[PDB]
Amino acid sequence: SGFRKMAFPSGKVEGCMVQVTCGTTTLNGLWLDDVVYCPRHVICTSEDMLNPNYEDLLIRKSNHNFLVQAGNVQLRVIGHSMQNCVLKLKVDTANPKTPKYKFVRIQPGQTFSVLACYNGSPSGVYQCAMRPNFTIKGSFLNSSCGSVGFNIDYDCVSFCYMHHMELPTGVHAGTDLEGNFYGPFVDRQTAQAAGTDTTITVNVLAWLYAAVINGDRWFLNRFTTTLNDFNLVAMKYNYEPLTQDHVDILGPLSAQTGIAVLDMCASLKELLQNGMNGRTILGSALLEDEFTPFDVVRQCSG
Amino acid sequence: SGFRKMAFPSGKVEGCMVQVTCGTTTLNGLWLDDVVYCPRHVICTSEDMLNPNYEDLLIRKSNHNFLVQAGNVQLRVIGHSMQNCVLKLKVDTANPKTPKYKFVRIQPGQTFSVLACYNGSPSGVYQCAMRPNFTIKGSFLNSSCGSVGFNIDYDCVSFCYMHHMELPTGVHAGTDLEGNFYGPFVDRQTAQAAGTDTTITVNVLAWLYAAVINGDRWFLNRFTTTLNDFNLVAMKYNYEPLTQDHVDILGPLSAQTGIAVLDMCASLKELLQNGMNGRTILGSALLEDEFTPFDVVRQCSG
Ligand SMILES: *C(=N)[C@H](C[C@@H]1CCNC1=O)NC(=O)[C@@H]1[C@@H]2[C@H](CN1C(=O)[C@@H](NC(=O)C(F)(F)F)C(C)(C)C)C2(C)C
Ligand SMILES: CC(C)(C)[C@H](NC(=O)C(F)(F)F)C(=O)N1C[C@H]2[C@@H]([C@H]1C(=O)N[C@H](C=N)C[C@@H]1CCNC1=O)C2(C)C
C-alpha cells in the first residue's frame, strides 16, 4: 500500500535525447528514427525573440547551421523543415534506441511524465497535469527547452508535450510534438500570462478514492448530493464542472471501493465547505487534482 | 522556475530488473554483472513467514530451484549465497546493461528514487526519504519485494534500498544492498510497528531556502534564534534536533540567499506557531521534509 506521485519509467525516452545547437542557442531534441524534433526558437538570436520571423530566419539557414550532438557522437543534418513551432532536422543516422511511439495531443486534466533535460542529458523525471488554463507546473531552468512530456502504454511511448517557455507566474508552456501550442500562447519573448486556473474536480474525486483504497476514510460523510448541486458548490470554489463523462470514468474506483461517485461528491462538498480540521488525506493539506482515475487504478493494481 | 518532487532517470536501473521465482513465490531481483540480488524471503512458503529459519530453508535448495527470467530469457543460476537478508544468485551471463554502480548505506533524512517493479517489470518511479524512524513512505503492493532505491551522480547508480515489507501504519521497511535492514525491523511476519515519526528539520530548512531562491519571502521575520532555543521549540512539534553538521550543510543555500541559517530557523519557528494562514510554499500547505539541501541545489541551481 501507500500512494505516491508516480512517474512513468523514463528509460525508453532517455535513449532519445540529443543536444541541438544553432549558433549560440543550445537546447534539447527528441531523436526518433532519422529526425530530431526541437523548438523552432532554437534558430532565434537574442534580438529575434520579441518579433521572430521564423519562415524568414529558417530560409537563411543551411543544414550545417544545426549541430545535433547524440551524447559524444555528432549527427549530420541532411534536411530541415518547420511544422508549426517544432523544427524537424533530418539526420544522416537513425536512432538505434527508437521506441514504439506515437505523437498524441492531451486534454486539460490529463497527466504525464516530464524528463527534464539540459544539453541533451536527462536530469530528472516528474509527473505533471495539463492545467485547465493549458499550462503545466514544471521545474525548468535555462536550456530545458526540448524537454518532453510522455505516457507509456504497454511498450508504446505516447509523446504529448514539448517545453517552450516560462510564464511570469513560474508556470510552463509548450506544444504537442506536432508543434501546436497548448493554450493561447506564442513562442515570442513578449508579454504573456497564464489565465486563471481551476481545480480538476474528477481528479480530486479519484484522489479521495485513492485515500479510501489506503484506509484513509475520515472525510467520508452521510449526504448524497445531485450532480447539479455539487457543480454549483464547485463553480463557487473555481472547481471544473463534473460531467457524466467524469462520473462514468470514476466507475472502476466506485466499484473497487463500493462508494458511489455522488456519495464521494457529497464528501468533497463537505471538504470544500469546511476544510480538513488539521487532518490530512494521504499526507496532503490540500485537495490534490493531479491524479487521474486511470492513475489511481494503475498505481493501486501495480 | 518551479519545484517538483523529482526522481532520477530510471533507465540505468530498468536495465537491471529481473524476475526471481521459487516454488510459487515470484519477486524482483537486481541483476548486476553475474549476480542477482533479491530478498532472501523468496525461499519462504505460506507457513514459514512467522519464524523462518533461513539457513535451514536455503540448504534444502539447489541452484536449479531458482528460476531467474530477464524479459523472455531465463538466466542459469550456477551459485547461491546468503548475505544477511539478501540472497545472491551467481548467473552464467553478465548483464550487458550493467551501469557504473556502487552500494551505499544511507542515513535518515537522505532521499532516493524508487523504481516500483512487479515480476521484473517497471510500474513507476517516485522520490522517497529515509525517515528518522528508519521507514520510507513508499507505494508497494503484493510481489513488490526486490524493487530498489537509488541515486545517480553523473553516470554512477548508487543502490541504497531493497524492499522487504510494509508495517501496519502503511509505511515501508527494507535493507541496504548488503541485506542489512534499515532500523530495528526483521524479515518475519512477527508483530512490528514503526516508532513515532519525526520531521526532518534540515530538509524543511533546505526547502524554505528553495522557496526563497524561487522568489518567495512572505514567511521570513526580523528575528534570529540560538540553536538551543530552536531545538527546545522544534522538539515540541516532533521535529528532529538540528545539529551544527545540519547548520554547516545549509551554508551554500545561506550564501545564495544571504539569510543566515539561524535567521531561517527563526522563520521555521514562527511557521510552526502560525502555519500558513491560507498561503502555500512551493505549492504546499504543509512544511515539506523530503528534499535535502543537496536536492534543492540540484533542482534550483541546475
Ligand atoms: C528554454 N530553453 C527557455 C527558458 C526556460 C523555459 C522554462 N523556464 C525557463 O527558464 N525558454 C525561453 O527562453 C523562452 C523562449 C523565448 C523567451 N522564453 C521564455 O521562456 C521567456 N518567457 C516569456 O517570454 C513568456 F512569459 F511570455 F512566456 C523568459 C522571460 C525567458 C522566461 C521564447 C522563444 C518564448
Ligand atoms: C504487509 C504484510 C502483513 C504482508 C507483511 N508485513 C509484516 O509482516 C509486518 F507488519 F510485520 F511488517 C509484509 O510486508 N511481509 C511479510 C513477509 C514479507 C513482506 C511481504 O509480504 N512483502 C511483499 C513482497 N512480496 C510486499 C508487501 C505487501 C504489501 N506491501 C508490501 O510492502 C516478509 C516480512 C518476510
R_g over Cα of chain A: 22
Residue B268: how many CA atoms within 13 Å on its side-chain side?
A: 37
Q: Which three cell numbers stand for residue A56?
A: 524568414
Q: Which three cell numbers stand for residue A97?
A: 534506441
* Ligand 2 touching residue B140 (CB < 6 A): yes
Which neighbouring-strand residues pair with B18? B29
Gaps in chain B (C to N over 2.5 angstroms) fall after: none
Q: Which three cell numbers stand for residue B223?
A: 528575528
* Ligand 2 touching residue B187 (CB < 6 A): yes
Pick the closest to residue A276 from A237, A219, A200, A233 (CA basis). Answer: A219
Q: Residue B284: exposed, middle, or buried by beta-carbon count in 10 A (0-12, 13-18, 19+)?
A: middle
SS3 of A183, please?
Answer: coil
Residues contacting residue A187 through CB under 8 Å, at least 6 positions apart: A39, A40, A41, A52, A85, A164, A165, A181
How far apart, in Å, are the Cα atoms of A29 and each of A17, A119, A143, A177, A256?
A: 6, 9, 11, 11, 41
SS3 of A59, please?
Answer: helix
**What is the spatial distance between Cα B19 and Cα B80, in angstroms, rounded to a whole number?**
16
CB contact under 8 A, B1 and A170: yes
| Enzyme catalytic residues of B | 41, 145
Mutate to test the interface with B, among A114, A115, A126, A274 (most CBs of B within 10 A): A126
How far apart, in Å, are the Cα atoms of B214 and each of A139, B209, B296?
A: 11, 9, 11
**What is the spatial distance between Cα A199 and Cα A220, in angstroms, rounded to a whole number?**
20
Topology of the domain covering B11-91: Thrombin, subunit H (2.40.10)
SS3 of A25, please?
Answer: strand
**What is the spatial distance between Cα B239 and Cα B232, in angstroms, rounded to a whole number?**
10
**What is the spatial distance between Cα B280 and Cα B265, in angstroms, rounded to a whole number?**
18
SS3 of A123, please?
Answer: strand
Question: What's the A165 CA to ligand 1 centre distance in angstroms?
Answer: 4
Q: Scan for cell 535451514, then name that residue.
A: B56
* Ligand 2 touching residue B41 (CB < 6 A): yes
Q: How far is A143 from chain B (nearest CA, A)?
A: 10
**What is the spatial distance between Cα B164 and Cα B147, in angstroms, rounded to a whole number?**
9
Q: Which three cell numbers stand for residue A156?
A: 508504446
Please give the DSSP secondary-structure letter assigned to residue A5. Answer: -
Which neighbouring-strand residues pair with A124? A116
Give the A:B interface size as CB pairs under 8 Å. Answer: 130
Residues of A with CB under 8 A from a CB of B: 1-12, 14-15, 115-116, 118, 122-126, 137-141, 166, 170-172, 214-215, 280, 283-286, 299-302
Residues contacting residue A298 through CB under 8 Å, at least 6 positions apart: none
Residue A231 CA to chain centroid, in angstroms? Answer: 26
Residues contacting residue A4 through CB under 8 Å, at least 6 positions apart: A299, B124, B126, B127, B128, B137, B138, B139
Backbone angles phi, psi at A239, to 5 degrees: -95, 140
Residue type, A301: S
* Ligand 1 touching residue A46 (CB < 6 A): no
Q: Scan for cell 474536480, then name that residue.
A: A201
SS3 of A111, please?
Answer: strand
Please give the DSSP secondary-structure letter assigned to residue A216. Answer: -
Residues contacting residue B284 through CB under 8 Å, at least 6 positions apart: A285, A286
Q: Which three cell numbers stand for residue A69?
A: 550532438
**What is the spatial distance between Cα B122 and Cα A11, in angstroms, rounded to a whole number?**
10
Pick the closest to residue A221 from A256, A271, A255 (CA basis). Answer: A271
Contact A80, A88 (CB under 8 A): yes
First to last CA, chain B: 11
**Beta A156-166 vs A100-103: how paired, if at all?**
parallel
Pick the closest to residue B102 from B160, B175, B55, B61 (CA basis). Answer: B160
Task: Output the CA torsion sign for A68, A174, B153, B252.
Answer: positive
Q: Scan for cell 508535450, then name that residue.
A: A161
**What is the spatial distance between Cα B218 and Cα B12, in angstroms, rounded to a whole number?**
41
Mind spelling out the 3-state secondary structure of chain B?
CCCCCCECCCHHHHCCEEEEEECCEEEEEEEECCEEEEEHHHHCCCHHHCCCCHHHHHHCCCHHHCEEEECCEEECEEEEEEECCEEEEEECCCCCCCCEEEECCCCCCCEEEEEEEECCEEEEEEEEECCCCCCECCCCCCCCCCCEEEEEECCEEEEEEEEEEECCCCCEEEECCCCCECCCCCCCCCCCCCCCCCECHHHHHHHHHHHHHCCCCCCCCCCCCCHHHHHHHHHHHCECCCCHHHHHHCHHHHHHHCCCHHHHHHHHHHHHHHCCCCCCECCECCCCCCCCHHHHHHHHCC
Residue B284 CA to chain centroid, in angstroms? Answer: 21
Long-range Cβ contact pairs of B59-65 (< 8 A, separation 24 or more): B61/B22, B65/B22, B65/B23
Residue type, A28: N
R_g over Cα of chain B: 22
Q: Which three cell numbers stand for residue B196?
A: 513515532
Q: Is B278 left (phi over 0), alpha (psi -120 to 50) or beta?
A: left
Q: How far is A121 from chain B (nearest CA, A)?
A: 10
Please give the DSSP secondary-structure letter assigned to residue A65. Answer: G
Atom of ligand 1 nearest to the CA of A44: 34
Topology of the domain covering B201-301: main proteinase (3clpro) structure, domain 3 (1.10.1840)
Backbone angles phi, psi at A247, to 5 degrees: -60, -50
How far apart, in Å, are the Cα atoms of A238 and each of A132, A200, A208, A235, A241?
A: 11, 9, 18, 5, 9
Contact A260, A248 (CB under 8 A): no
Ligand nearest to the CA of B144: 2
